[PDB]
Amino acid sequence: QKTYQGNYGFHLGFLQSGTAKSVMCTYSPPLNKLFCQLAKTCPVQLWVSATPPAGSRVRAMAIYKKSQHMTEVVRRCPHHERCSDGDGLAPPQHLIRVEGNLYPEYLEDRQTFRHSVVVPYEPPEAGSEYTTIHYKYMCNSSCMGGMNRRPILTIITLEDSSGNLLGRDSFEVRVCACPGRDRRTEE
């Protein structure tokens, strides 16, 4: 999917990680793909060249990468939906959760029924040029009844207070047992 830096030069950044066998989450620049273990926090950096207007929001939504599956709402498999691992904020069917943020909004589009999680957009801390949001994936890419080995992307959208698009970026994601090994193979 096309990126849209927009008027605020919005784009994503990822901490440099290796491919050690025990790594828990690692990003591949050449594949623009995140490899992470089930439910493991993934810090994602939000970079801007200019400060978005007050009240802006940041939405994270998952979609299937392949054209033939793109219309299907990405959700957790029946097993995980029922495993009772909710934090009391995220609906049990949501694949993507946010952690370390007091204001997450778990939404479901009235028309597409697609799930997404929004947090307020906040400027970078003191002595920092980016803002970090921590995401976690509650299902494995291999989950039958769920993603069922189908690769997905995590569309991150900067929107204004009215929900208008300000910027957009994305990255592919693979939730697996050994991110380090899988990253190496796919590369």
Smallest gap from Cβ 161 to Zn ion, in A, equals: 34
How many amino acids of this chain bind Zn ion (CB under 5 A)? 5
The answer on whether 139 is annotated among ligand-binding residues is yes
96 interacts with Zn ion by CB under 5 A: no
136 interacts with Zn ion by CB under 5 A: no
The answer on whether 94 is annotated among ligand-binding residues is no
The amino acid present at 5, given as its one-letter code, is: Q
Cα 161 to chain center, whole Å? 20
Site for Zn ion in 17-56 (CB under 5 A): none
98 interacts with Zn ion by CB under 5 A: no
Q: Convert 85-149 into a string of H (helix), E (strand) and C (coil).
A: CCCCCCCCCCCEEECCCCCCEEEECCCCCCEEEEEECCCCCCCCCEEEEEEEECCCCCCCCCCCC
- Which of 11, 7, 37, 43 shows the shortest CA–CA distance to 24? 37
- Residue number with CB closer to Zn ion (58 or 143): 143
- State the DSSP H helix or E strand holding residue 78, giving kind and residue range, or none if neither: helix 78-81
- State the DSSP H helix or E strand holding residue 187, giving kind and residue range, or none if neither: none
Site for Zn ion in 102-131 (CB under 5 A): none
The answer on whether 143 is annotated among ligand-binding residues is yes
SS3 for 6?
Answer: helix
Task: Check: CB of residue 17 under 8 Å from CB of residue 25.
Answer: yes
57 interacts with Zn ion by CB under 5 A: no
Question: Which one of residues 139, 166, 173, 175 is an interface residue with Zn ion (CB under 5 A)?
Answer: 139
Smallest gap from Cβ 139 to Zn ion, in A, equals: 3
- Residue number with CB closer to Zn ion (143 or 152): 143
Question: Which one of residues 80, 97, 115, 136 is an interface residue with Zn ion (CB under 5 A)?
Answer: 80
- Residue number with CB closer to Zn ion (150 or 184): 150
- Residue number with CB closer to Zn ion (95 or 166): 95
Contacts of 67 (CB under 8 A, 6+ apart): none
Summarize as ranges the residues that interact with Zn ion (CB under 5 A): 77, 80, 139, 143, 146
Annotated binding residues, written as ranges, equal 77, 80, 139, 143
